[PDB]
Amino acid sequence: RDKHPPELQVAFADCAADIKSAYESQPIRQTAQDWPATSLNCIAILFLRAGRTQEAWKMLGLFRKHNKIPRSELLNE
Amino acid sequence: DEPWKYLESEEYQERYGSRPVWADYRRNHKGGVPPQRTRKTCIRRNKVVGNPCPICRDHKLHVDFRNVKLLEQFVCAHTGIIFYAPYTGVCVKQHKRLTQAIQ
Amino acid sequence: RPPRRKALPPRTEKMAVDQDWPSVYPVAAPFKPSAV
Amino acid sequence: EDSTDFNDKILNEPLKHSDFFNVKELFSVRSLFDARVHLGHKAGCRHRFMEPYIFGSRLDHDIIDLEQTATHLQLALNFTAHMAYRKGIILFISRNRQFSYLIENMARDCGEYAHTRYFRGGMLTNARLLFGPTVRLPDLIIFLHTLNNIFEPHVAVRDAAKMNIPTVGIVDTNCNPCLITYPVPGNDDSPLAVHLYCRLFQTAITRAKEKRQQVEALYRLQGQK
Amino acid sequence: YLSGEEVEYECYAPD
Amino acid sequence: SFFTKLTADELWKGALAETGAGAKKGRGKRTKKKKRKDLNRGQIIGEGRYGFLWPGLNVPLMKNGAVQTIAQRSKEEQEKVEADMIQQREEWDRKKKMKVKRERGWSGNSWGGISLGPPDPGPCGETYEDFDTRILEVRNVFTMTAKEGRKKSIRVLVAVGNGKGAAGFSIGKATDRMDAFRKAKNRAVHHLHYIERYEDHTIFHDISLRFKRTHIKMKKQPKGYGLRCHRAIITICRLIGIKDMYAKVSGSINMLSLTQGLFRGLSRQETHQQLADKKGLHVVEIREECGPLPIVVASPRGPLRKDPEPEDEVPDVKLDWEDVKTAQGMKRSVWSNLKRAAT
Amino acid sequence: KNRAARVRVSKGDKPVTYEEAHAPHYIAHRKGWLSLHTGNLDGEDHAAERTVEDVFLRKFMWGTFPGCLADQLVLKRRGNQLEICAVVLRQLSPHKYYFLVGYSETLLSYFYKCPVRLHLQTVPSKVVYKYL
RNA sequence: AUAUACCGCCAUCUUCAGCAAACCCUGAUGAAGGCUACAAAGUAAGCGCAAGUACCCACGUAAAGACGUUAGGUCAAGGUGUAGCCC
Ligand SMILES: [K+]
Ligand SMILES: [K+]
Ligand SMILES: [K+]
Ligand SMILES: [Mg+2]
Ligand SMILES: [Mg+2]
Ligand SMILES: [Mg+2]
Ligand SMILES: [Mg+2]
Ligand SMILES: [Mg+2]
Ligand SMILES: [Mg+2]
Ligand SMILES: [Mg+2]
Ligand SMILES: [Mg+2]
Ligand SMILES: [Zn+2]
């Protein structure tokens, strides 16, 4: 929701990573994976603010694969 | 009707790849020196022998003067001579049909 | 495919160094690595 | 983009010059003659593959042709300097115990390695087991004495060739230079000869290491601006 | 020998 | 008695009889052998003859949001379960009966000519997928021992190669044949020769050499000639990448002498460039298919001599009576020039 | 040569547990007892009956938890209580382990007429002491 | 019936100190061989010895004692492969 000091932001990016893994390894993986738009925007924003830009750039593909609208804030950052 | 199509299909490429249809065939015989003639025929009264030759083992391979890509596999590219039947293992019946189709 | 069950972390990791230990082992019980 | 220029300005540039480190100024036929490098063993001890490098026999004592030694020594020092410049691991090997202490100190001073002790079976051909799977072997082995203490070739000469490691070696008139990459015909017994060899290699190696730092530093300063 | 060629995710509370 | 029963491991260790004076020296041979079977393999906890359905053990605990109660399968419904388990047992046996048969070697019972695959990847992430391994000899060696009498070990000879000139061979020794296979093939890739090939299909010139008592005569051949050589030479040549060559092996036909004799001769062949450099002359190839056209195959890198090579009216070269007897037609053999499979 | 309860040297590929790796002469020196009761103390009775019960419980648990036991049972008797401590694997679903615990505790309590408790410790794999 | 199919438990050299996977090297890459301390091709996990422990000590006595040798002993401790008996 908001930016935080670097120490907290790094912690939020380790949690978003574990959440990302949860979305990727859902038990509904047998069926199509449902990646909400808000989840993708937040996970991407948290990587940038943490400095894991490499991971954030990779995720941009998932906006096109699942056809999820990117958020304005994500594009500016 | 269009025998040259089989060699351009995916089934052919999966079974043979880029090697000749006789690459993986081996004659069964006693001794180190094989008999100087191959078997007369692999199809005898509509029944196929246990180890059919490269031509007889695939019913989609048609020896025809228009299927030149198959015929090229039985002619030496460097000398232009037709391989004798023990070279590839084709039965005498199919070797004659190949020799006539090549000519 | 169902995920294989993952063992939880030993509850020793949630114990405080100033806890009431008699509440953990109130009666004679076999040694439990996850609880000691 | 920047790596090709690095390897070209630093690694490939020294290889375009005949004497990039000026190792010819380190010795002369006179300096070698004063160290008694020309003195070889008696004719009865001569190895037949050392005959090309022998000037003659002075009263049944073989004399090593220092004009040839000078050319071979130039090549050996030149190779050694380039390998030190490229940050190669240089290992000194000798079993002559009169000079074990001298050689061990020379290696430590030049920042290299010495093996003057009993050579155990498989140090090179079985190094991964003895040291570990990630062990790095030497890039150059310099033999100040190529014979062991029973007057046979040091086992590391054969094993260095097996491991495709170039060898520099002082080869006296009773030694076999066939498998030594850069042999240097010379006296291996006299303290004056052996001390000279250690100064030349020590100086060549130390000079090449200083040259590598000078070039690198210059290449960085110019890179920023 | 010639006769025959001889012959991941973990999660809590799985359902 | 319930208390006299043992576990399956104890029962199979006894029944199999793998430890004993029979299995010590192979004093017992096994055309019929007791084979271990895992009898708990297809067994489900909770399933018994009576067909009871225990909630939470062999059937689901809750059904339609309510806890199931103890139930028993009907006599008919239980026969199907039993029959289905018997069929699953024969199907499993059929799956083990279906084993992919591997290609044979020089003969059905011979190890020679069989591929062992690529050598194992080295400790430091080294790989040899480009190399193929072929067996040349598998021998049973018998050592008389001070206390244990005649013991049986295996000596294996294998060759490795990548088909692009790099090939080698190594001996392997072990008590087990498959440990010997590992040793030889892994060792062979550390003793690789590089073999020069003319136009990447044949040798540069005729090679005639003797190694101990084994004589090998090899002839340079044109494309399409194939490998008309001793079967072991054929195997080695495919690993090197030679497609066209004739070879004749005479004298002692010792596989090891033949292998190392062959590699010694193939590693000492002078290429056309080496000949041009040595003599400072052009190497000119005359082909009958191209008529009188002179084809320069190699030119000296250094200066080119101006003095022609002396033309000895008659060369003092030693000839092979077999080659001369053939050229004249006096060589008549019922076994020569026989029709054979493509090699 | 002595054989009793000795896992013999092999090629270095056989994993043995701590208990399996210690021969009988190490009993009470490096390894303890798998059952503790008062029947074998001086002046105590009913050692024969405790011994038969122990032999049964080991067979009962081996076949009741087939493929699940990763080590020998530890049998403890205090008063009339019987505690069975087992190291088991993590392959069976937890529902099947709870079923078998409820089933085994009840059946053994009625068989031997004493309160019986079963204590399960799960390990991901058999704990290896050494490779003989 | 078969200990000459075995598990199990043992005798025996042992009142021994050796066995040995995985590597490496020599003999032309033959069957084979691999040690020298002022050392010359061997490195060696593991097992045994040793150490440790028991008994009254650190002594002694127990215990321990590998691999292998004798198709050593035992199918009659029990179990069990194969074969045989089932009025
Ligand atoms: K026995
Ligand atoms: K018995
Ligand atoms: K029996
Ligand atoms: Mg000397
Ligand atoms: Mg056969
Ligand atoms: Mg005894
Ligand atoms: Mg016996
Ligand atoms: Mg004592
Ligand atoms: Mg005793
Ligand atoms: Mg002891
Ligand atoms: Mg007997
Ligand atoms: Zn046919």
Side-chain angles (χ1 to χ4, degrees):
Chain A
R1 188 180 62 183
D2 305 317
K3 286 169 180 178
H4 303 284
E7 295 171 16
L8 192 58
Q9 208 69 57
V10 169
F12 285 5
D14 300 0
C15 178
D18 197 339
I19 291 171
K20 185 176 173 295
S21 173
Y23 273 115
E24 282 181 321
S25 308
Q26 289 180 75
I28 306 301
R29 181 177 181 171
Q30 181 176 3
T31 309
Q33 295 282 23
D34 174 31
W35 285 74
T38 48
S39 298
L40 282 160
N41 291 289
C42 299
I43 296 159
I45 290 162
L46 291 171
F47 287 147
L48 300 172
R49 299 176 178 171
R52 306 142 75 103
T53 60
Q54 173 176 252
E55 312 311 318
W57 288 109
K58 293 163 174 171
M59 282 193 76
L60 297 176
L62 295 162
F63 288 81
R64 304 172 63 83
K65 180 191 294 187
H66 293 85
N67 189 12
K68 308 284 174 160
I69 294 150
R71 186 196 296 174
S72 52
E73 179 161 52
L74 171 57
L75 298 167
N76 300 8
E77 294 193 354
Chain B
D1 306 330
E2 295 167 328
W4 54 88
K5 276 180 168 50
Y6 177 58
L7 275 71
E8 306 176 296
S9 61
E10 301 173 358
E11 180 182 352
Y12 179 93
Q13 189 71 18
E14 295 164 4
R15 185 172 172 171
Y16 306 105
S18 66
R19 312 173 76 206
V21 297
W22 51 262
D24 60 324
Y25 180 83
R26 179 163 181 183
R27 274 173 79 195
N28 301 324
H29 60 93
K30 74 170 144 178
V33 180
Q36 294 299 277
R37 60 178 183 185
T38 57
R39 74 167 61 94
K40 181 158 169 161
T41 187
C42 314
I43 322 288
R44 188 175 287 273
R45 296 177 185 172
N46 290 336
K47 303 156 62 181
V48 190
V49 296
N51 189 32
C53 81
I55 298 301
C56 297
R57 71 185 172 176
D58 188 358
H59 71 101
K60 289 171 183 171
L61 294 174
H62 302 285
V63 177
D64 184 73
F65 78 103
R66 297 172 298 169
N67 194 11
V68 293
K69 293 293 188 184
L70 179 61
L71 305 177
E72 287 169 22
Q73 300 181 29
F74 298 87
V75 182
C76 184
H78 311 288
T79 58
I81 66 89
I82 302 165
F83 300 131
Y84 48 69
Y87 189 84
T88 62
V90 294
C91 51
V92 172
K93 183 189 179 71
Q94 293 302 328
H95 182 261
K96 290 167 171 174
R97 295 181 69 250
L98 280 161
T99 293
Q100 288 170 356
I102 287 165
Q103 190 60 53
Chain C
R1 175 85 203 179
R4 185 184 297 275
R5 180 186 195 80
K6 188 182 165 192
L8 284 164
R11 61 193 188 88
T12 53
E13 302 176 2
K14 301 162 63 189
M15 289 176 183
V17 295
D18 57 325
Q19 65 175 348
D20 179 63
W21 172 255
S23 300
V24 181
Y25 262 78
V27 296
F31 176 76
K32 286 168 291 204
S34 55
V36 179
Chain D
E1 302 174 1
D2 190 13
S3 177
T4 54
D5 188 11
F6 182 95
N7 302 315
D8 180 15
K9 278 181 167 193
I10 286 162
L11 291 172
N12 294 331
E13 175 61 12
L15 302 177
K16 296 175 175 198
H17 302 287
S18 59
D19 202 355
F20 184 74
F21 302 99
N22 196 30
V23 303
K24 77 187 70 170
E25 198 193 4
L26 293 177
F27 66 95
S28 59
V29 177
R30 169 51 72 175
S31 84
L32 299 167
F33 192 89
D34 294 332
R36 304 179 210 168
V37 173
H38 62 286
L39 303 182
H41 293 261
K42 283 202 76 189
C45 311
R46 196 194 300 117
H47 201 287
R48 93 171 283 168
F49 294 155
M50 283 295 304
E51 287 171 2
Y53 309 116
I54 286 163
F55 184 83
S57 50
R58 176 62 178 175
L59 291 158
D60 283 321
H61 288 92
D62 284 336
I63 301 297
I64 298 163
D65 184 11
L66 292 184
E67 301 295 352
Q68 291 194 78
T69 300
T71 52
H72 288 78
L73 182 56
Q74 174 64 25
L75 284 167
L77 285 171
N78 184 80
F79 189 84
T80 296
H82 278 288
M83 292 306 299
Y85 179 94
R86 298 160 82 84
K87 304 181 166 168
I89 291 170
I90 305 174
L91 177 63
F92 293 91
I93 300 182
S94 169
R95 291 293 297 124
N96 187 340
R97 305 183 310 106
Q98 181 167 4
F99 306 110
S100 176
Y101 184 80
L102 173 85
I103 296 165
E104 288 177 338
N105 276 321
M106 174 265 293
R108 196 187 60 262
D109 298 338
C110 61
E112 299 300 354
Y113 306 87
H115 194 321
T116 68
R117 310 299 182 159
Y118 171 79
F119 205 88
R120 289 186 298 149
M123 297 302 292
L124 297 167
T125 71
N126 202 11
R128 302 195 178 193
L129 200 59
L130 304 171
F131 301 108
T134 60
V135 67
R136 188 181 158 192
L137 282 185
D139 302 300
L140 174 63
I141 296 175
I142 303 182
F143 294 90
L144 300 165
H145 304 76
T146 60
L147 298 175
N148 60 27
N149 284 343
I150 60 148
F151 299 97
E152 311 292 285
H154 197 290
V155 66
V157 177
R158 177 200 79 199
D159 284 359
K162 282 183 184 288
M163 304 308 297
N164 283 262
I165 302 171
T167 48
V168 170
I170 308 296
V171 284
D172 205 354
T173 75
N174 63 340
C175 301
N176 190 336
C178 64
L179 283 177
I180 295 162
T181 310
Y182 292 92
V184 180
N187 177 348
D188 64 2
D189 295 287
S190 305
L192 287 168
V194 178
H195 282 58
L196 178 62
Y197 303 142
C198 292
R199 279 197 306 277
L200 297 176
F201 288 116
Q202 190 174 341
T203 302
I205 294 169
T206 291
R207 269 194 203 170
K209 290 178 178 199
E210 291 167 4
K211 187 77 180 169
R212 176 64 182 259
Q213 297 300 312
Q214 292 159 21
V215 178
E216 280 175 332
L218 178 62
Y219 173 89
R220 296 301 183 192
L221 170 67
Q222 177 174 345
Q224 288 182 339
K225 297 179 180 183
Chain E
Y1 182 88
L2 287 179
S3 176
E5 296 183 7
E6 202 69 1
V7 188
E8 310 100 324
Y9 194 71
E10 224 189 12
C11 185
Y12 299 149
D15 290 347
Chain F
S1 182
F2 177 70
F3 295 100
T4 47
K5 294 176 176 269
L6 299 177
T7 56
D9 286 356
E10 290 165 312
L11 291 165
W12 284 114
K13 192 177 174 179
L16 293 173
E18 298 179 357
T19 57
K24 282 179 212 181
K25 316 212 179 178
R27 269 151 172 170
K29 54 185 174 198
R30 276 169 186 280
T31 299
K32 181 181 177 181
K33 63 180 180 180
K34 185 66 62 179
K35 181 62 174 172
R36 176 148 189 165
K37 181 172 178 191
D38 183 8
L39 299 173
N40 308 316
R41 187 263 309 169
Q43 287 206 64
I44 300 150
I45 300 180
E47 290 294 336
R49 302 196 325 183
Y50 291 178
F52 276 97
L53 305 170
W54 309 118
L57 187 62
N58 57 325
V59 303
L61 177 68
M62 285 158 293
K63 183 176 173 181
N64 305 325
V67 182
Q68 284 198 81
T69 59
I70 295 173
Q72 195 179 1
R73 275 190 288 261
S74 65
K75 190 185 290 179
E76 293 75 9
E77 196 184 344
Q78 182 62 19
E79 291 179 350
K80 175 181 172 178
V81 165
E82 303 282 4
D84 194 319
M85 292 176 71
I86 285 168
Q87 164 167 16
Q88 178 189 30
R89 176 186 69 205
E90 290 190 11
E91 183 178 2
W92 181 272
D93 287 3
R94 186 163 184 175
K95 292 179 179 179
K96 304 291 172 186
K97 184 176 186 180
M98 286 300 299
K99 296 179 179 179
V100 180
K101 70 185 185 182
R102 288 151 150 165
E103 187 177 359
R104 72 162 168 279
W106 301 331
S107 73
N109 201 65
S110 178
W111 286 98
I114 285 166
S115 179
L116 286 172
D120 302 329
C124 62
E126 204 141 76
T127 51
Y128 313 86
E129 302 104 346
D130 199 356
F131 283 81
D132 182 53
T133 302
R134 293 284 169 170
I135 302 168
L136 302 174
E137 186 188 74
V138 179
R139 175 190 295 177
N140 292 341
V141 292
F142 296 100
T143 301
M144 301 296 296
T145 51
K147 294 179 179 179
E148 315 181 12
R150 195 178 296 97
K151 291 180 72 176
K152 185 185 185 178
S153 165
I154 310 292
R155 195 189 83 174
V156 177
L157 177 55
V158 315
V160 298
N162 66 345
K164 300 187 289 292
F169 68 97
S170 187
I171 294 169
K173 294 179 181 179
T175 299
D176 182 23
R177 189 179 296 98
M178 310 307 296
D179 302 332
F181 289 153
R182 182 196 65 252
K183 293 178 190 184
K185 84 172 173 172
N186 297 350
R187 186 170 185 281
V189 278
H190 303 308
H191 296 81
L192 293 173
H193 307 243
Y194 185 80
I195 307 298
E196 291 279 13
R197 299 171 297 158
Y198 171 82
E199 289 179 359
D200 291 343
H201 80 90
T202 188
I203 58 175
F204 271 97
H205 51 82
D206 292 0
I207 298 164
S208 168
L209 82 156
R210 191 194 67 260
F211 184 94
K212 296 182 171 179
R213 295 286 91 208
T214 304
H215 303 75
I216 317 177
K217 294 179 179 57
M218 292 181 275
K219 290 182 178 180
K220 177 178 191 291
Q221 297 294 344
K223 295 187 173 180
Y225 186 90
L227 298 171
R228 295 176 46 184
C229 312
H230 182 292
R231 63 197 190 175
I233 300 175
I234 294 168
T235 294
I236 290 164
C237 282
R238 294 197 180 111
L239 296 172
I240 296 165
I242 293 163
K243 285 79 169 185
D244 311 284
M245 197 173 70
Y246 173 87
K248 182 68 179 82
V249 178
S250 63
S252 310
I253 320 297
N254 177 8
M255 188 61 61
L256 188 55
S257 291
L258 172 60
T259 301
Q260 66 193 333
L262 182 74
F263 272 94
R264 176 186 282 240
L266 287 171
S267 65
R268 300 170 180 189
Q269 68 181 310
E270 189 193 27
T271 67
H272 288 143
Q273 189 58 67
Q274 289 168 22
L275 183 64
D277 298 351
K278 176 166 72 189
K279 294 188 173 294
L281 294 170
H282 291 288
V283 184
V284 182
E285 172 176 77
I286 300 296
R287 284 178 170 193
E288 299 190 44
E289 63 264 32
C290 304
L293 180 64
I295 305 137
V296 181
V297 290
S299 306
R301 300 211 186 78
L304 180 60
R305 267 168 55 189
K306 295 276 177 178
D307 52 302
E309 188 79 36
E311 296 176 36
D312 187 2
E313 303 175 61
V314 190
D316 195 359
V317 300
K318 304 209 172 179
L319 303 172
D320 197 7
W321 172 231
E322 291 165 52
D323 293 334
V324 168
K325 191 166 47 170
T326 307
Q328 295 172 186
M330 296 165 61
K331 166 60 174 176
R332 306 176 186 79
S333 183
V334 303
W335 297 101
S336 299
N337 312 313
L338 287 182
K339 298 180 182 189
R340 295 178 191 255
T343 61
Chain G
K1 292 187 292 189
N2 303 322
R3 315 292 297 182
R6 285 162 171 82
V7 179
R8 304 208 80 83
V9 69
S10 178
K11 313 177 79 174
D13 68 304
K14 183 202 307 190
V16 301
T17 60
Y18 183 89
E19 317 308 325
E20 295 163 9
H22 286 90
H25 60 270
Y26 293 119
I27 292 162
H29 301 246
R30 300 187 187 176
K31 70 194 296 198
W33 291 286
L34 291 167
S35 65
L36 281 176
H37 58 86
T38 57
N40 286 317
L41 298 160
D42 185 75
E44 293 295 354
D45 297 319
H46 309 322
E49 292 79 354
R50 304 296 81 82
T51 303
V52 166
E53 296 165 4
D54 288 358
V55 172
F56 173 75
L57 297 166
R58 292 181 193 281
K59 285 187 70 63
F60 178 89
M61 288 288 291
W62 185 259
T64 306
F65 296 81
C68 305
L69 289 177
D71 210 327
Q72 295 299 319
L73 298 177
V74 181
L75 304 173
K76 302 170 176 297
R77 290 186 177 83
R78 296 192 304 275
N80 70 328
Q81 300 173 73
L82 174 68
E83 284 194 334
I84 304 174
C85 311
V87 180
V88 296
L89 296 172
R90 294 175 173 175
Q91 305 183 6
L92 271 191
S93 68
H95 293 76
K96 290 178 197 199
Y97 273 121
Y98 273 96
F99 181 99
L100 294 171
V101 164
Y103 154 83
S104 64
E105 287 180 347
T106 302
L107 205 80
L108 296 169
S109 300
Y110 281 76
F111 193 62
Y112 287 138
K113 311 297 175 196
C114 68
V116 181
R117 257 189 298 179
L118 174 52
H119 299 276
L120 297 181
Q121 184 193 140
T122 66
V123 294
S125 50
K126 209 149 168 166
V127 182
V128 176
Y129 176 62
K130 61 192 292 207
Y131 286 90
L132 275 171

